[PDB]
Amino acid sequence: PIQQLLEHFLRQLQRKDPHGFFAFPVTDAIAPGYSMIIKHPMDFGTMKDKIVANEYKSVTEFKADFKLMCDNAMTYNRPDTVYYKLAKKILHAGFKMMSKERLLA
Amino acid sequence: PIQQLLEHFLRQLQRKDPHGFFAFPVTDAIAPGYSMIIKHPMDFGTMKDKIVANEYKSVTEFKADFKLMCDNAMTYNRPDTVYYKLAKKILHAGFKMMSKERLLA
Numbered sequence: 001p002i003q004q005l006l007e008h009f010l011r012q013l014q015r016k017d018p019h020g021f022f023a024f025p026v027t028d029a030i031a032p033g034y035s036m037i038i039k040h041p042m043d044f045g046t047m048k049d050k051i052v053a054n055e056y057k058s059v060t061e062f063k064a065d066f067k068l069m070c071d072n073a074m075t076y077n078r079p080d081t082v083y084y085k086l087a088k089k090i091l092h093a094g095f096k097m098m099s100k101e102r103l104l105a
Numbered sequence: 106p107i108q109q110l111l112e113h114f115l116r117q118l119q120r121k122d123p124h125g126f127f128a129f130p131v132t133d134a135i136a137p138g139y140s141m142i143i144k145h146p147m148d149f150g151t152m153k154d155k156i157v158a159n160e161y162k163s164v165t166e167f168k169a170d171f172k173l174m175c176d177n178a179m180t181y182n183r184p185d186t187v188y189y190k191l192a193k194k195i196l197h198a199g200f201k202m203m204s205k206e207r208l209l210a
């Protein structure tokens with residue numbers, strides 16, 4: 001169904017994150033106080049399961065989570081950091097990838 | 106190409122580092138003061154080129170670089186950190202992989 005289209009989009013984005021910083025949830029162990037600051041955590045790992053269980057109706061629900069993942073990254077980490085810089089790149093990239101016009105292909 | 110047992114050893118270790126923390130040089134941007142503390146930096150990226158140019162004579166030359174990479178990691182980073190813990194895992198793994206007895210094969 002539309003699950004297949006999301007898996008195409010997901011694999012496009014996972015490839016843009018070669019070091020897998022967005023691969024499973026961030027822990028307080030590696031990110032002090034992450035759980036207190038980000039109350040809506042999101043990751044490709046979580047977005048994979050939600051395609052496996054067809055819990056995505058629209059594209060717009062998928063990109064909502066995708067944006068939440070990048071906003072979390074740009075909210076917890078300083079602009080100086082690898083996690084911030086990669087978040088902004090991936091956010092702007094995915095939005096042009098899953099856009100109104102490019103969806104017509 | 107007689108020396109490809111190094112490439113066997115290398116790809117065993119690279120796979121133990123899925124996030125690719127040992128894949129190219131650490132920068133002071135990512136690691137404050139790295140250049141001051143570690144004067145002999147080493148990485149799989151550097152070790153790949155040195156197989157491409159067959160600059161490794163013995164196994165013991167390869168393990169020497171391998172050890173330097175892990176000892177750098179266990180010198181610069183605190184025990185608490187993911188880079189330290191992965192260094193000690195890879196160190197104990199490579200030592201059993203490239204050991205006195207297993208070198209018979």
Ligand SMILES: COc1cc(-c2cc(C(C)=O)n3ccccc23)cc(OC)c1Cn1ccnc1
Nearest residue numbers: 020021022023024026030031073077083124187
């Ligand atoms: C998805 O797995 C990881 C994520 C991050 C990571 C990701 C992020 C983000 C997305 O904010 N982050 C923020 C501060 C500190 C670390 C991180 C950093 C990581 O290693 C430095 C890893 C890989 N990891 C986790 C546990 N062992 C390895």
Ligand SMILES: COc1cc(-c2cc(C(C)=O)n3ccccc23)cc(OC)c1Cn1ccnc1
Nearest residue numbers: 019082125126127128129131135136178181188
């Ligand atoms: C090979 O690329 C990386 C290496 C490390 C990393 C590796 C190490 C080591 C092994 O000491 N290290 C020590 C302190 C802080 C970071 C690191 C951490 C990384 O991201 C958090 C990255 C990935 N990276 C670098 C620039 N863009 C992505």
